[PDB]
């Protein structure tokens, strides 16, 4: 007549953390209202083209220098 007792009792717990940390800040268009604030009144744009400028004695000369004429330089 022998005795042989059984109690080793062990379980796990605990979890694991997945909290999210990828916030993007946005912005507005820079691009167009920066231009805006450059141009005069009149958007001085080639019609030859399809480029912008603000800049009348540019636009002047621009528009004469699309002929074969005048020196380039
Ligand atoms: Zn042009």
């Not at 062990?10 to 920066?34: Q, T, Y």
């Amino acid at each position: 007549m022998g005795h042989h007792h059984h109690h080793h009792s062990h379980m796990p717990n605990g979890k694991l953390k997945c909290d999210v940390c990828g916030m993007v800040c946005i912005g507005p268009n820079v691009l167009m209202v920066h231009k805006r604030s450059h141009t005069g009144e009149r958007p001085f744009h080639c019609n030859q083209c399809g480029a912008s400028f603000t800049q009348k004695g540019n636009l002047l000369r621009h528009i004469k220098l699309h002929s074969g004429e005048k020196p380039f330089k």
